[PDB]
Design a protein around this ligand. Structure first.
Ligand SMILES: [Cu+2]
Ligand SMILES: [Cu+2]
Ligand SMILES: [Cu+2]
Ligand SMILES: [O]
Length: 476
């Protein structure tokens, strides 16, 4: 069989009432010829790409047609807490909530997904995620590849695992609360190993790691380079050439890659050094999509300069906030031993060389920040508005991967896990790696968040977030 074409999310803009309609519902998808119940926005799986323009407001009407509560968070978008869609932004089953987004940040590829309390991992695993394309006046003057679905394509990469009857097999239990939910099947915009036909010249890929727990590392099958032009929060100052591109859960990068006649190539993901993530078929480079060149000229450019990146300010006198992540040692050991028992030594490939005792021992609140599992009723602190702060996030104490995400901002990384950030990670970010070490980021919050609709800060390894590794904070 030929490969299926890469599905392209619809690019959605407002109506004359300046509204975008999103319906959240359950439907059916097919994977490897077996049907599965899946959830989507405006469809059965995944979602559209909502297009936003800096300095323009849009209203989004969100209809929850599931039979359980959900929320909708705009990951990467800087909006007041009242419309941020964290766990307090409940949408009742069968109900509607509307939000007005006043877009006030540079061009970037952001995304949106559920943030239901304690259930975010399951609702993402069932299929809910969408995209956000922010444009501004500056980016259009660059004349980047811009034909949506032709030379400008989103690539949402996610793993799933399925039970024998075809259904998605999601369980939040001691082992996945320890190591994360991961599977053996890789999806690219919902499809297994699709092909994308691209014109000759530059192809722009907007990459999103939409996995619950798996980190990825993109490369090409014939070692042609990727030119990074943008990170989570928008353009870099100039392109950064890379041979491989690590992407943590919830992160985005946009890259340009050359397309040459007669020479198809794959986008692949290379094995990572993360517990559990190098079990077959991920013990070897794994294709994500085939790029099929078409002998029609692509008109996009890769300019020498993309944007201006301001200097870091002086750090003296800035408020320093400490965020100590932690896991329960007993439950970490129990979950890691179940992983080893199931898959054996391969569950640590690439790494450096039973009774009920009550609620005190419940894994659902085993993961914590500053000694507390997420308490929706008690924001941990009140951050300053319009002031830079230095947030120091420590994973010392365990060796699991914590891609740490802060709502309400695009920050600058000062230290990523004990080293200055790589050049393609030195621009605007909303995620920073923490793994066995300490990171420090420079953040500023331009919008208010009250206690009733607080901003979240958490690990984007969803099973850890859902089992307590999140805090709430207010701004203003
Ligand atoms: Cu997110
Ligand atoms: Cu977010
Ligand atoms: Cu979040
Ligand atoms: O998130």
């Amino acid at each position: 069989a030929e490969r299926p074409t890469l599905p392209i999310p619809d690019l959605l803009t407002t109506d004359a009432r300046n509204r975008i309609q999103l319906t959240i519902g359950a439907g059916q998808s097919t994977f490897g010829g077996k049907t599965a119940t899946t959830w989507g926005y405006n469809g059965n799986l995944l979602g559209p790409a909502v297009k936003l323009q800096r300095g323009k407001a849009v209203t989004v009407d969100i209809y929850n047609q599931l039979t359980e509560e959900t929320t909708l968070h705009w990951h990467g978008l800087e909006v007041p807490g009242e419309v941020d869609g964290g766990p307090q932004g409940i949408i009742p089953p069968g109900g509607k909530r509307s939000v007005t987004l006043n877009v006030d940040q540079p061009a970037a590829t952001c995304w949106f997904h559920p943030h239901q309390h304690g259930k975010t991992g399951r609702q993402v695993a069932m299929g809910l995620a969408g995209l956000v394309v922010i444009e501004d006046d500056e980016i259009l003057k660059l004349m980047l590849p811009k034909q949506w679905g032709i030379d400008d394509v989103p690539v949402i990469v996610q793993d799933k695992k399925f039970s024998a009857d075809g259904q998605i097999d999601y369980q939040l239990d001691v082992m996945t609360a320890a190591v994360g939910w991961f599977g053996d099947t890789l999806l690219t915009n919902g499809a297994i190993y699709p092909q994308h036909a691209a014109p000759r010249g530059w192809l722009r890929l907007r990459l999103l790691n939409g996995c619950n727990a798996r980190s990825l590392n993109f490369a090409t099958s014939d070692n042609r380079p990727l030119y990074v032009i943008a990170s989570d929060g928008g353009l870099l100052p100039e392109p950064v050439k890379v041979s491989e591109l690590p992407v943590l859960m919830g992160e985005r990068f946009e890259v340009l890659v050359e397309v040459n006649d007669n020479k198809p190539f794959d986008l692949v993901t290379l094995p990572v050094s993360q517990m559990g993530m190098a079990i077959a078929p991920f013990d070897k480079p794994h294709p994500v999509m085939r790029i099929q060149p078409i002998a029609i000229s692509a008109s996009g450019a890769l300019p020498d300069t993309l944007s201006s990146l301001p200097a870091l300010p002086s750090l003296e006198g800035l408020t320093v906030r400490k965020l100590q992540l932690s896991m329960d040692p007993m439950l970490d050991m129990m979950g890691m031993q179940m992983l080893m028992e199931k898959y054996g030594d391969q569950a640590m490939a690439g790494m450096d060389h039973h009774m009920n005792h009550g609620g005190k021992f419940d894994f659902h609140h085993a993961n914590k920040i500053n000694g507390q599992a997420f308490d929706m009723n008690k924001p941990m602190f009140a951050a300053a508005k319009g002031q830079y702060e230095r947030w120091v996030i420590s994973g010392v104490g365990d060796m699991m991967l914590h891609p740490f995400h802060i709502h309400g901002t695009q920050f600058r990384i000062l230290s990523e896990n004990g080293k200055p950030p790589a050049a393609h990670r030195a621009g605007w970010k909303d995620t920073v790696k923490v793994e066995g070490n300490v990171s420090e980021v420079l953040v500023k919050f331009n919008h208010d968040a009250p206690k009733e609709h607080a901003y979240m800060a958490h690990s984007h390894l969803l099973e850890h977030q859902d089992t307590g590794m999140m805090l709430g904070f207010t701004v203003g």
